């Protein structure tokens, strides 16, 4: 579904 944006380059996607 939806993911979170931790930092630049760090993104836990779906």
């Amino acid at each position: 579904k939806k993911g979170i944006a931790i930092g630049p380059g760090r993104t836990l996607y779906a």
Partner: antibody, heavy 125, light 109 residues
Framework: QVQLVQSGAEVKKPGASVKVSCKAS????????IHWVRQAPGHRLEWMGW????????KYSQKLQGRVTITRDTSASTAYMELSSLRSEDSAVYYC??????????????????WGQGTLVTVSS | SYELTQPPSVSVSPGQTARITCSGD??????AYWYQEKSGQAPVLIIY???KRPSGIPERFSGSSSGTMATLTISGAQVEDEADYYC???????????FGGGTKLTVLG
């Protein structure tokens, strides 16, 4: 316990550059990222960019790409924001905000809404 | 280049439920975040991750997201809720954040 303290207000001339600091305390500075948000006194919130406390990688707003440079000092636990070629449209209050999540799995500690007190810069001659 | 669209202003009566929307193309696969900024103060995070509510926020604040449209609901607002409300989310890659235009809530009477 978590706190973000910014530098004081400044004055600049059109064409100069301003640099605001943002000292962090109460958490691992390298585990979180720090945003930068500007807002004119009578306008809307604007996202500038953010930087990782550990990686140091930056992602700036496409409006401000080329003028803004966000840095950080791990030993001082302080992130910096520098904006060059200042014009009258830059007179605003500049905030620094810690990212919601930390680490590789995007967890949260005992807070997630951490904002600095704000720095009002005024470009004028 | 990514943008979040909010209504410019909404009006409500005391006790009524006010709905503030936020439309974005990446909202289907990106979370939404809401901020309340009163006149002369700093913004306050009232809703994070579409629906979750942080500690210390009144229970009358809630949010939902479906499709390319997020919504902020205030059940039984009072005069204290009269402020500006901004949207907040990321783009497709998730490296840059964008604020919404800002919705001004006005309580009547």
């Amino acid at each position: 316990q978590v706190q973000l303290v910014q530098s004081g207000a400044e004055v600049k001339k059109p064409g100069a550059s301003v640099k605001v600091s943002c000292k962090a305390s109460g958490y691992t500075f390298t585990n979180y990222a720090i945003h930068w948000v500007r807002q004119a006194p009578g306008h809307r919130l604007e996202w500038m960019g953010w930087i990782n406390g550990g990686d140091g990688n930056t992602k700036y707003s496409q409006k401000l790409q080329g003028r803004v440079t966000i840095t950080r000092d791990t030993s001082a636990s302080t992130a910096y924001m520098e904006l060059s070629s200042l014009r009258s449209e830059d007179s605003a209050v500049y905030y620094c905000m810690r990212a919601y999540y930390y680490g590789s799995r995007g967890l949260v500690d005992d807070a997630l809404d951490v904002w600095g007190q704000g720095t009002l810069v005024t470009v004028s001659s | 280049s990514y943008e979040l669209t909010q209504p410019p202003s909404v009006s409500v009566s005391p006790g009524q439920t006010a709905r503030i929307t936020c439309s974005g193309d990446e909202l289907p696969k990106k979370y939404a975040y809401w901020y309340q900024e009163k006149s002369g103060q700093a913004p306050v995070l009232i809703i994070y991750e579409d629906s979750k509510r942080p500690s210390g926020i009144p229970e009358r604040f809630s949010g939902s997201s479906s499709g390319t449209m997020a919504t902020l609901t205030i059940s039984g607002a009072q005069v204290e809720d009269e402020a500006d409300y901004y949207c907040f989310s990321t783009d497709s890659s998730g490296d840059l954040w964008v604020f919404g235009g800002g919705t001004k809530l006005t309580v009547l009477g």
